[PDB]
């Protein structure tokens, strides 16, 4: 039968949610998968463990790449093996692999905005926390956020970062409310943000004045969305990363690579034809909280808080 690899970044429970989503789909199209990660970022155990897939003989790779640009050797060898790649999670657009499947980030950063614009009415005053201003998925997130906002009277006052600090994050949270009083609102990129944000606010006395949009699903974060201080906090989708990736692989051994490209999403990218698989976002909010914390147990997902 078929033996599929999958190559995470880290032990991490969003990488065990990967996991999953790349069993369910084994079961299911009845192939076996063998997914790695090492215990903590690490592109040389990573590199390692292609060259075992290849030397195994998979029959399909899947990895999301520590070193974007280190692994592209590999991929090219796994290639010339008659060995399909694809990319999950993080991209090495160089690389030689077939397709990409992971958070379309301008995308996801616009649903933030669509959000917000709609929690604020199309008027206010917003500051955003973030915690890179070089990163791709930072400045897509926000790229995102402005363009879905543009249209309206809704003004971003403030961009603070916090250089991937959250004591920082806090700090620059509490800056923007003593700075601006008529504050309406807190974006926040990462995933460190919206809690920071949601501890300024709640300290500050301000939960419902203003309000809070943000990034992933983690306990903290479904903690403050169950409390009502944060309203929406975009949810990426792991599971269906590893999902997707078996099946496109597996696709690609079925019916051959040409035949599953055509079915999938097509990008140009410098007159150069490629395939993207957004794997989108959900959007949590006190409301359908209840909703989203059933679909994750029935994914056999856990949520701690």
Known sequence: MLTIGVIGKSVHPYW??????????????????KFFVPQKCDINAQLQMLESFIAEGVNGIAIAPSDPTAVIPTIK?????????????????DSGRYVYIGTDNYQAGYTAGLIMKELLGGKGKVVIGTGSL???????????????????????????????DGARAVSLAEAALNAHPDLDAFFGVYAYNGPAQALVVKNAGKVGKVKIVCFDTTPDILQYVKEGVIQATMGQRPYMMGYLSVTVLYLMNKIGVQNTLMMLPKVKVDGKVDYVIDTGVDVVTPENLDEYLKKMEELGIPIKF
Request: hydrophobic share 40%; proline share 3%; with cysteine.
């Open 16 to 33: 065990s949610q990967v996991e999953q989503g790349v069993k369910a789909a084994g079961k299911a199209l009845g192939v076996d998968t």
């Open 134 to 164: 070089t990163a791709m998925n930072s400045l897509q997130r926000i790229q995102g956020f402005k363009d879905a906002i543009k249209d309206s009277e809704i003004e971003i006052v403030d961009i603070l970062n916090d250089c991937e």
């Open 77 to 93: 060898k796994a290639l010339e093996m008659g060995i399909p790649v694809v990319t999950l999670d993080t991209d090495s657009p």
